[PDB]
Amino acid sequence: NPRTVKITASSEETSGENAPASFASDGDMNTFWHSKWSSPAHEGPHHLTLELDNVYEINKVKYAPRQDSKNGRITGYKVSVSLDGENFTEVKTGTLEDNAAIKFIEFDSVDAKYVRLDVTDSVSDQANGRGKFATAAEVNVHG
C-alpha cells in the first residue's frame, strides 16, 4: 500500500506533448511519462524515482508500459532503494520482454522510502531509436 508522494525523472516531455513524470504515478493506462524528446532532447541515461510517504518494506515494482507506442519501452532496468533520497543500494537488475504487457520486478523484502528505476535498455519503433527514449504508463511499488 505505499503512497507515491512524487515521481521525479531524468527528464520529461511537456512541450511536444504532455507527458510529465507524475503521469506515471497513477493507474490511467492512457496517460504516460515520456523522457524529453523535443529539442533540446534528453536521450539518456534515463531514470525515474518514486518518493514514498514513509519507509516501507517492499519486494515488488510494477511497470505498465506506454499503451499506444513502443517508443521508450523499458527492456533493461536496475532497481535501487534509499532511505534518505541520496544514497541508493542496487537491489535488482534484469531485462523485460518487448511487448506492452504489465511487468513485475521482484526482489527480497527491503526497507525503502525512495525507489529508483534506471533504464539501462529501451526500444523504439524508430530504426535508430534504441535507448533514446523512456516511457511508462505507470510505475508502482508493493510489499
Ligand X SMILES: CC(=O)N[C@@H]1[C@@H](O)[C@H](O[C@@H]2O[C@H](CO)[C@H](O)[C@H](O)[C@H]2O[C@@H]2O[C@@H](C)[C@@H](O)[C@@H](O)[C@@H]2O)[C@@H](CO)O[C@@H]1O
Go through 100-112 and write b for each residue having 16 or more CB atoms within 10 A of its CB, e for each that does not: beebebebeebeb
For residue 14, the partner it binds in ligand X, Ca ion, none, with Cβ less than 5 to 8 A by kind, is none
For residue 88, the partner it binds in Ca ion, ligand X, none, with Cβ less than 5 to 8 A by kind, is none
Q: Is 133 in the site for ligand X (CB under 6 A)?
A: yes
Report the C-alpha gap between 108 and 143 in whole angstroms.
10
Site of grid cell 527528464: 11
CB of 133 to ligand X, least distance (A): 6
Q: What's the grid cell of residue 46?
A: 534515463
Q: x/- binding map, residues 38-57, to ligand X, per CB under 6 A?
A: --------------------
Residues found near ligand X in the complex (CB under 6 A): 17, 34, 37, 69, 71, 125-126, 133
